[PDB]
Amino acid sequence: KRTVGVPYRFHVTPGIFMNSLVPVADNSGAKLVRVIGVVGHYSKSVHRRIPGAGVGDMVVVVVREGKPELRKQIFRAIVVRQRRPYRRPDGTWVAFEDNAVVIVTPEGDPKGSEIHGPVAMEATLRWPTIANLASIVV
Amino acid sequence: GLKINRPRRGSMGVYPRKRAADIVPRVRTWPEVNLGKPTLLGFAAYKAGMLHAVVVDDRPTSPLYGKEVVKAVTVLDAPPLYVAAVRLYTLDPTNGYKVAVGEAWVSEPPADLRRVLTLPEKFDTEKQLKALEEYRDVAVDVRVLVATQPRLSGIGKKTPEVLEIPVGGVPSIDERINFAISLLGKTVSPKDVFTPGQLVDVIAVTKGKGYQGVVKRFGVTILPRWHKHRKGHRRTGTIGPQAPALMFTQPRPGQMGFHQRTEYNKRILKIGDNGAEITPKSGFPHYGVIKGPYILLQGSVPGARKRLVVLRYPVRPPKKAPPAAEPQVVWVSSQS
Amino acid sequence: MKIHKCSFCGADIPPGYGIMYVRSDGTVQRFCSRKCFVSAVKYGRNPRKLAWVRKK
RNA sequence: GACGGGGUUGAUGGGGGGGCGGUGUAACCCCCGAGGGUUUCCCGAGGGGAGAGCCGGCCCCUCCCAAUCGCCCGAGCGUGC
RNA sequence: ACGUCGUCUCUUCCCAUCCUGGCGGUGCAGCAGCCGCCAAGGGUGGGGCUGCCCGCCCAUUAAAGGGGAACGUGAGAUGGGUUCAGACCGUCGCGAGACAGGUCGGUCUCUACCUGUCGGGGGCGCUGGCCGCCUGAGGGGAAGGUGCCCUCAGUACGAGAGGAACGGGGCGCCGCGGCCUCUAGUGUACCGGUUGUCCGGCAGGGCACUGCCGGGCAGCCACGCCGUGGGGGAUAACCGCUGAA
RNA sequence: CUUAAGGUAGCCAAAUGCCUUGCCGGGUAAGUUCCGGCGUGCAUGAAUGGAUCAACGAGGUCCCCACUGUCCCGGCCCGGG
RNA sequence: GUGAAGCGGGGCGAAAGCCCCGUGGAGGCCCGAAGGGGUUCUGAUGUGCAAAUCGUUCCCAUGACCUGGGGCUAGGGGCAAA
Ligand SMILES: [Mg+2]
Ligand SMILES: [Mg+2]
Ligand SMILES: [Mg+2]
Ligand SMILES: [Mg+2]
Ligand SMILES: [Mg+2]
Ligand SMILES: [Mg+2]
Ligand SMILES: [Mg+2]
Ligand SMILES: [Mg+2]
Ligand SMILES: [Mg+2]
Ligand SMILES: [Mg+2]
Ligand SMILES: [Mg+2]
Ligand SMILES: [Mg+2]
Ligand SMILES: [Mg+2]
Ligand SMILES: [Mg+2]
Ligand SMILES: [Mg+2]
Ligand SMILES: [Mg+2]
Ligand SMILES: [Mg+2]
Ligand SMILES: [Mg+2]
Ligand SMILES: [Mg+2]
Ligand SMILES: [Mg+2]
Ligand SMILES: [Mg+2]
Ligand SMILES: [Mg+2]
Ligand SMILES: [Mg+2]
Ligand SMILES: [Mg+2]
Ligand SMILES: [Mg+2]
Ligand SMILES: [Mg+2]
Ligand SMILES: [Mg+2]
Ligand SMILES: [Mg+2]
Ligand SMILES: [Mg+2]
Ligand SMILES: [Mg+2]
Ligand SMILES: [Mg+2]
Ligand SMILES: [Mg+2]
Ligand SMILES: [Mg+2]
Ligand SMILES: [Zn+2]
C-alpha cells in the first residue's frame, strides 16, 4: 500500500473554476492548462453553480500551452497556489501571489520531477508525493 | 415539474415569518438532566458583542488537537437573576395538560418589579407556601419566576424581564420543590447554573431587518442576465401555476428578522465574575461596558446586541461529551 | 499566540488579524491590515516615505 | 401603524470632558533645496524636524439644555335558563 | 377573440424508482454485474452542438429517473424559431403569383376592481374590568440530505490476477437557520492627493451630477464564521417461532 | 427518341442539397453552426449573367487576443419614483 | 487628417531609370462639432411630454449635401433612386 495523506479536507474558498486558465508549477512540459473538471466528494454543485477548487483539490485539466505532444491532452492536477484568500482551520488568513497547479496521475503522483515555487500546506498534507518534491511549504 | 432539479428556496419550517409575539424568548422545551443536585435548568443574559479568542483544542481525536486555534466568541452580560416566585404544576386528568396549581411570592418584591406587575404592598408568603404545600402530592414540575436586573447590566434600563425557569437535576420532585422554595427572594448567578466547558442551547429573538424582498427573504435568484427583464429583476418570474392558486409555499416579500430561533450545542468557554477583564477599552460597540459576571460562548448567538438570551441545558447533545476539564482560553481579542 | 510584525509598518499583529501573503519567490510577508497590504503590494509604496509609518 | 427603552425618585437625545478609532503629519517656526537674481538674507517645485490637524450616524463620565405643559379611554347595571 | 414553440423564473403533485433506505434471487467465489419486491423523505448537477424540444457528445458524479399542473407559469420576462407586410435563391406557374424548402430584416399594450398569497395594523368577543406568567387543541417543517479518507486489511474470498464487509476514528459537498469576531465588498459619514476654471494671490472654497483618484469608522453583507441528532412505536416487502385444521 | 438542343467554362451540401448532424480534414474537453476539400448537383451555371473580395459596409456569420457584475452570486451605495 | 496631377533639391547610377526629402493642394477621400439621418439597447414611455416622443448607442457630414421663399404636376389622375 501507499503512504496516506490526511483524512480531512477543511473548507477552502475556491480560487479556480471551469474554464479557468492556470499556470503549471512543475517541469512536466505543460505550461498553461484549462480547468475542465473537479474530482472528488466536494465536486458536486447545485443548479447554475459552477464547480470550483481550492489549494489541495484535484482538478481535470487540458494542456493549452506547452510541449507539442501534450497539447489538447487531458490530465489530472493538484492546486498548489491560489490568489483567492482562504482561512485555515486554525484561523489564519492566507493568500498567494498567483494560481498554480501540478500535473499528477489519477492516484496523485506528479508527472514532473520538480515543483517550482511555494506550495500550500493543504496540498502537501493531502498528497504525500507532492510533499516529497515541494522545496518551500507554506 | 421543474425543468432542472434543485432544492426549494428557503425553509417552510419557519412559516409564517411573522414578527415574534414577544421580544423575550419563550422556551417550549426544557431537558431532563441528572446532575445529582437540584439546580435551575437555564439562565437569561444580555448579548453584549462578539470577539475572537485563542483557544487550545482539547478534543483528542480532532486533527487540531493540542493546537491554538482562533474561535469567534459571543460575550453575554449576565447579572444575577432575582427569584420572585415559585410555581407548581400538575397534570389535568381530563386531557393530560400541564396546569399551574398555585404559586408563592416573596413578601417584599423589589420596587422595579412594580414597573411590570400589579402587586400588593405585601405578599403574605407563609399562607401562599401553606396553600402550595397542599398540592405537593400531585406536583409533577416546579419552576421559579425570575426577574432580570438590568440596572446591573450595561444597558442600564430599569424595567426587568420576567420568565419561568424550571428546577431540575434530580428525579425527585420533592427535593426540587424544597430547593425552589429555598431560593425565594435570593439571586442566582451564572456559576450556580452552568459549568465552564459544557454545552448549552441558546434561544433568542433574532435581529430585526424590517420588510424585505423575496431575493433576501428566501434566496430566490435575481433573474439571470438581469438587464434584459422588463418590470425588474429582484423578483420571481411567476407566482404560481394556474392551480392550486397562490399557495402558502410561494416565496413572497414580508417581514424579515425579529423571529424567535433556537440554536444548539454552543460551548461555554468561560464564566467570569467581573466584566472589566473582557470589556474592550473602547467599550462594546453599541452596547457599553460589562461590570459584573459574564459568559463567553463559542460561536454566534441569535439576536441584536442588547437582546435577552436564554441559555438552557442541551436537548440534542452529541454522543461524545466535551472534556471534563475547563477549556484553555489563552487570549481574547479585547485584551492587550 | 505568537506575535508577528507587519511587513510594511512594523506593528505587532495580534492573533486572528491580518493576512499572510506569499510572494512568487516564496517569501512570506504578513500585513496587519488592508491598508498596509495594498501599500506594499498593489501600489508599491515606500514605507520610509510615508509619514504615518515613520511616526508610528 | 405596531414594538422596545426613558421620562426628573432621570443619564432618554443634545452639549462639554475623557476613551477608542479613520486619515496621514495642518498652521507657525527652524534646516536642506536644482539653479537664477535686486550679487550670500530675494525667488524656487520639493525634502526633513517638532507639533499633527481635521473628523466619528461608537463607549464612559458630567444635569449645562431638553424629556414639559397638558389631552383622553376605562369596568360599576339589570334578566332568564 | 382563452395570447400561438422553446427557454428563464417559481411552486406543488404522481410513481410505472435513476441514486439514497429495506429485502430477495442469480448461470451471486471476491471485485463488479443482471433481475424482482417494498419504498416518493431527500437528491437527480456542470458544460459542448442546435431557435429548439428531443438527441448525440465532454469532464465529473451516490445518481446525474420519468411524468402531471389550460402541452403549469408572456395583465411575470425573453422573442432565437414558427407564423403578416420588404428582399434574395431553388423549384413550380404563360402570367400575376405559390412552396409546412433555404435565407436576411421585422412595435410583446393595461394606474390591479375582486379573490388569492405574503407580511403589517384597529376593534369586538372570551359572561364585571385589568396586569403578569403559563398551558397546548390544532397548524407548518426536509431541517436536514449525501459523499470521501484512515483503520479493519492487501485480511476474508481466490489457482492467480485481483480484492471486500460490519464496527471504530476524521472531514467535506448540497440544503436550512443564525451571526459580524476575522477576511472580503461597500461605505456620495470622514481624511488626504490632484486636473480645469472662477472667487485678486496664499489659505479656504464653488462647479465639472462624490470632478477624478487613494484610504476608510459604524452599519449592512458573503467570498467569512457558528449551529444543523440520535432514539422510540406501529408497520411495508418479507424473514422466523410455536402450531393445528 | 421526346415540345429545339442536350448544361460548355466554371462553381457547390451555396442565402441554391430533400435525404442530411452527407463523407473526410481544421478549430473545441465536447462544433446539428463555421472554414477547407469531395460531387451522375431532390432542383447550380453564364449580361436569365458565370467565376471573382482589392477597396468599402449600422449588411449576415464563425474563430482568436484583450476585456469585463453577462455569469458563478450576490452585496453595498447615490439621485428620482 | 490624408496628400493626386504638377514643381524643386539630393543620392545611386554607363543609358534609361530608380530611391529619399520637400513643395503643391485633388477627392460623390477619412476622423469629428453644427446640421441632416434614424442602427442598437428589441432602454424609458406605452389612459404618453407626444394619435410616433425621450435617453443611449449610432450613420453622413465638399456633396447624387442640408435648408428658407416663390413656382409647376390632381384622382383611374399625379409623383415615385420602386
Ligand atoms: Mg424588453
Ligand atoms: Mg369569450
Ligand atoms: Mg387569460
Ligand atoms: Mg383576453
Ligand atoms: Mg411502487
Ligand atoms: Mg402552457
Ligand atoms: Mg406579454
Ligand atoms: Mg398569464
Ligand atoms: Mg424572431
Ligand atoms: Mg428570422
Ligand atoms: Mg416569414
Ligand atoms: Mg419559367
Ligand atoms: Mg402592475
Ligand atoms: Mg406534524
Ligand atoms: Mg445563509
Ligand atoms: Mg471609497
Ligand atoms: Mg490654493
Ligand atoms: Mg459658480
Ligand atoms: Mg458636485
Ligand atoms: Mg459540369
Ligand atoms: Mg463564389
Ligand atoms: Mg451541391
Ligand atoms: Mg452556410
Ligand atoms: Mg439549371
Ligand atoms: Mg440569377
Ligand atoms: Mg437559371
Ligand atoms: Mg455575377
Ligand atoms: Mg452606405
Ligand atoms: Mg466624404
Ligand atoms: Mg426592433
Ligand atoms: Mg422598447
Ligand atoms: Mg407604464
Ligand atoms: Mg464623419
Ligand atoms: Zn501594517
UniProtKB/Swiss-Prot annotation, chain A:
Asked if the record carries the keyword Ribosomal protein, the reply is: yes
Secretion signal, residue range per the UniProt entry: none
- Functional description taken from the UniProt entry: Binds to 23S rRNA. Forms part of two intersubunit bridges in the 70S ribosome.
Q: Name one GO cellular component term.
A: cytosolic large ribosomal subunit
Q: Which SMART domains match?
A: Ribosomal_L14
Into which family does the record put it? Belongs to the universal ribosomal protein uL14 family.
Pfam families from the xrefs? Ribosomal_L14
**What's the protein name?**
Large ribosomal subunit protein uL14
Report any one BP term from Gene Ontology: translation
Q: How would you summarize the oligomeric state and partners of this protein?
A: Part of the 50S ribosomal subunit. Forms a cluster with proteins L3 and L24e, part of which may contact the 16S rRNA in 2 intersubunit bridges.
Cite a single GO MF annotation.
Answer: large ribosomal subunit rRNA binding
What taxonomic classification does the UniProt entry list for its organism? Answer: Archaea, Thermoproteota, Thermoprotei, Thermoproteales, Thermoproteaceae
Q: Which UniProt keywords apply?
A: Ribonucleoprotein, Ribosomal protein, RNA-binding, rRNA-binding
Superkingdom of the source species:
Archaea
From Swiss-Prot, chain B:
Highest taxon above the source species: Archaea
Q: Which Gene3D superfamilies match?
A: 3.30.1430.10, Ribosomal protein L3, domain 3, Translation factors
Q: Name one GO molecular function term.
A: structural constituent of ribosome
| Keywords associated with the record | Ribonucleoprotein, Ribosomal protein, RNA-binding, rRNA-binding
| PROSITE patterns for this protein | RIBOSOMAL_L3 (PS00474)
Ranges for the region named Disordered are: 227-254
- Keyword Kinase annotated: no
Composition bias (Basic residues) maps to 227-236
Is the keyword rRNA-binding assigned to this protein? Answer: yes
Q: Name one GO cellular component term.
A: cytosolic large ribosomal subunit
One Pfam family name is Ribosomal_L3
Its GO biological process annotations read: translation
What is stated as this protein's family in its record? Belongs to the universal ribosomal protein uL3 family.
Quaternary assembly:
Part of the 50S ribosomal subunit. Forms a cluster with proteins L14 and L24e.
Concerning NCBIfam families, the annotation shows: L3_arch, PRK04231.1
- What does the UniProt record say this protein does? One of the primary rRNA binding proteins, it binds directly near the 3'-end of the 23S rRNA, where it nucleates assembly of the 50S subunit.
Under the heading PANTHER family, the entry gives: 60S RIBOSOMAL PROTEIN L3-RELATED, LARGE RIBOSOMAL SUBUNIT PROTEIN UL3
Which HAMAP family does the UniProt record give? Answer: Ribosomal_uL3_A
What is the designated name of this protein? Large ribosomal subunit protein uL3
User: Which species does this protein come from?
Assistant: Pyrobaculum calidifontis (strain DSM 21063 / JCM 11548 / VA1)
From Swiss-Prot, chain C:
SMART domains reported for this sequence? TRASH (SM00746)
What's noted on cofactor binding?
Binds 1 zinc ion per subunit.
| One cellular component term from this protein's GO annotations in UniProt | ribonucleoprotein complex
Q: Which cofactor does it need?
A: Zn(2+)
Recorded hits in InterPro entries, A to Z, give:
L24e/L24_sf, Ribosomal_eL24, Ribosomal_eL24-rel_arc, Ribosomal_eL24-rel_N, Ribosomal_eL24_CS, TRASH_dom
Q: Name one GO molecular function term.
A: structural constituent of ribosome
Name the SUPFAM superfamilies on file.
Answer: Glucocorticoid receptor-like (DNA-binding domain)
Which keywords, in A-to-Z order, does the entry hold? Metal-binding, Ribonucleoprotein, Ribosomal protein, RNA-binding, rRNA-binding, Zinc, Zinc-finger
Gene Ontology biological process terms in this record: translation
Which stretches of the protein fold into C4-type zinc fingers, per the record? 6-36
The cross-references to CDD domains, in alphabetical order and at most eight, read:
Ribosomal_L24e_L24 (cd00472)
Q: Binding positions for Zn(2+)?
A: C6, C9, C32, C36
On assembly, the entry states: Part of the 50S ribosomal subunit. Forms a cluster with proteins L3 and L14.
Family matches, as NCBIfam families: PRK14891.1-1
Q: What does this protein do?
A: Binds to the 23S rRNA.
Family to which the UniProt record says this protein belongs: Belongs to the eukaryotic ribosomal protein eL24 family.
**UniProt-recorded name of the protein:** Large ribosomal subunit protein eL24
> Can you name the source organism?
Pyrobaculum calidifontis (strain DSM 21063 / JCM 11548 / VA1)
Identify the coding gene: rpl24e
